[PDB]
Amino acid sequence: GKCRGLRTARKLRSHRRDQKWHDKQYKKAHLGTALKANPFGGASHAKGIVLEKVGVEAKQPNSAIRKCVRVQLIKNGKKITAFVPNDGCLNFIEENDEVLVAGFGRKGHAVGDIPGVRFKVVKVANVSLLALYKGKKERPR
Amino acid sequence: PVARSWVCRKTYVTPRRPFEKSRLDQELKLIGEYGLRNKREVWRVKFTLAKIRKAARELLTLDEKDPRRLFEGNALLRRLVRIGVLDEGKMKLDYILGLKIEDFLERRLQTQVFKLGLAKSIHHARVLIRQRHIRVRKQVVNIPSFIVRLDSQKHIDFSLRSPYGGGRPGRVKRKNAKKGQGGAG
Amino acid sequence: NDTVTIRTRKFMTNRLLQRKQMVIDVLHPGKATVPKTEIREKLAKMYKTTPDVIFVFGFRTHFGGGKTTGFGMIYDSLDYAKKNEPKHRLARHGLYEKKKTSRKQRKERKNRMKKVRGTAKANVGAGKKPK
Amino acid sequence: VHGSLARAGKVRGQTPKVAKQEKKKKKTGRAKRRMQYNRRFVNVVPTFGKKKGPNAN
RNA sequence: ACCAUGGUGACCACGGGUGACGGGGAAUCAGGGUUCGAUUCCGGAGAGGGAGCCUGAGAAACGGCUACCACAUCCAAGGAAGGCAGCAGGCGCGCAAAUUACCCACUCCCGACCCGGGGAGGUAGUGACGAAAAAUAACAAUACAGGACUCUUUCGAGGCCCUGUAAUUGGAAUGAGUCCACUUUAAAUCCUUCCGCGAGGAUCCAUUGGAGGGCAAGUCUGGUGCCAGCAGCCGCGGUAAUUCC
Secondary structure: OOOOOOOOHHHHHHHHHHHHHHOHHHHHHHOOOOOOOOOOOOOOEEEEEOOOOEEEEOOOOOOOEEEEEOOEEOOOOOEOOEEOOOOOOOOOOOOOOEEEEEEOOOOOOOOOOOOOOOEEEEOHHHOOHHHHHOOOOOOOO | OOOOOOOOOOOOOOOOOOOOHHHHHHOOHHHHHOOOOOOHHHHHHHHHHHHHHHHHHHOOOOOOOOHHHHHHHHHHHHHOOOOOOOOOOOOOOOHHHHOOHHHOOOOEOOOOOOOOOOOOOOHHHHHHHOOOOEEEOOEEOOOOOOEOOOHHHOOOEEOOOOOOOOOOOOOOHHHHOOOOOOOOO | OOOOEEEEEEEEEEOOOOEEEEEEEEEEOOOOOOOHHHHOOOOOOOOOOOOOOEEEEEEEEOOOOEEEEEEEEEEOOHHHHHHOOOOOHHHOOOOOOOOOOOHHHHHHHHHHHOOOOOOHHHHOOOOOOOO | OOOOOOOOOHHHHOOOOOOOOOOOOOOOOHHHHHHHHHHHHHOOOOOOOOOOOOOOO
16 A cells, blocks of 8 residues: 555655666667666767768568668767668778768667667768659769 | 847647547648648647647536636637637537647638638639738738638738739739730731 | 828827827838839928928838838927937938948957057057058 | 560560640649638548548559 | 763664755756756855964954975075966867956945946857747739639639749838938947948849658669678668668
8 A cells, every 4th residue: 555644745755766767668769778877878879981882671570681880970980870760771881981871760679580780871971862863962073 | 148038939740649540630621621731730730629628628627716717717708709710609618629630720711711712712812812912901810820810800801912902913924015015016 | 193092090299209209101012122212202292391301111011012111200300300319310311420440350450459559649540551 | 584684674665655745834833722721621531431632542 | 171972774874975065046847856056146165275363243264374295486596485176278188168348327336435346247259059039022914823703504714712833023012231410338249220322033142951661751763792781670782672872
């Protein structure tokens, strides 16, 4: 049973502030270690240079190779992998360009069947990835 | 710092769930039977019809002869009596709860210029109002959503600078008297 | 001239400023917005002075033509029109000369005098030969 | 092999290119709402078939 | 200075953290609440970091001074001068933010003051942060397809309304644009007003995403064959894919 009497509002309010540390979405937003750990550092997008193309293999029901990179950032530089979210657009990016990696859709969890990628590539070399795919823009000369 | 205004509010409202098929069909046949441009200006007048029904239904949980129910409630009703959506002899705070969306779309300028006979084919009324032909008494207005009152409801007409009330024809009648008189007599 | 009618309203005279001030609305059906000097001679034949003390301004055409409206005023005299009048509307019909430097020069002139003390023979010729 | 890391953009580079031809423009805005208020609502279709949708083939 | 041994604490002291300036407020919206509040209003704090003063009614002032620390300018090498968290601007950091423009005309302020000054503030340029109005066509004569209206009837087609082909036109239709003149303002710009030009693919060209289910819309054709790819989720792909291109 719980408390109910016209004097226990210290007990109930103290019982609530320490039991809120047991769901995740309060704990990762108010403990501080979860944002000193994500590569974005609490932002929405990040530029970083491309180190190495890597092709990861999709989950067991499926069977394909998902095209990925090994971007190392400029803001407090950290090693991440990022997905190139289109059909032919890995062929646009080359060695040590700068790309604007974004979030990938469900808040730092992997979407789809790519095992453990967290980020996707938009805007390689300051031109948009959809613009390259649609023939709007190109690489510099 | 600045003498700027800083104050604005949204006029329309987005629906709570989208893509439900029974809504956007019965809300489609308002877009054509009163002749509108998009569903924002249905969502406009829905939010207008919403907050009146919010205000009126708040006035029913009050006890009778409450001083702000008598003031603000009666000033509400004469505000939608002067605009011609609510007929005057039946003024109650209960008949307003029966008012629907279809009666605000009748009191626009854009369809009080169709039924008055000044235009046909309701989509043509937008081609006449916005294209600067139709006035209210001494003020020509190119606005479809001009909610015309009941007082200045007899005085919708074409204007005096307008072609339909004056002259000095536009660039196509002047061209038609030029296309025969530009290379010969 | 033909159909340009000068109504006015909210008339007020004062011996505080020796002016007669009133709100002008001009009703013109089929013209452009009439000039300021086309109207200020028409108040010369309504309040019976000469069109020298009539200053009209702030004309604002309503949407669709017809009634533009403004504010205008009439002093009692021209020596009253010089004292209690702002210098820009006195220059609407040329009666005051304000053609000075830009204010960027006048500041730098003031900051260049600031670095020279006392020497009145050089407090005025503080970089006025280099033109 | 099973598409290891090469031939990225395989099916895009070898689809044949059919040209995007042209029609009369679609009406925009208010007149576009007129032409589909007419198509769905004012025109009672006398034929049946469990009222098949507007993109049927 | 001389005596007294006190004070606070599980009713959370003390120490730590804060991505902590506080508030009027803002987003949310059944009620209870959740979360934001650097930011024009009130109050506080500080001008690179700490410190010390002068004048003055009011400053421990920094577009005041002295000193150290830190950063940095000129030098003829003896010395000198620095403090944009003011306005513009520059570099740098970054996912991420405007012109080295005009004027005290307005709102106020200061002064010995009806007169001077004010990057306070005002005006414009940038401005798809955001909010409000609102174009990209409308009527026709055929015309082809439907409607309780037509014959004493599923005869025969309609003199009658609505739609869409596909038209041919048109005409007191007009704007975006062009451009005089006013008006507008301190001066201008806009906006409104108004001459004059300005629409038949009005080519004067509306896009961004979707079309298995959630979730509104194709089992249409071609290509690729667990490949390339898609897919927030369930899933779709291995030679006829309603899901890729």
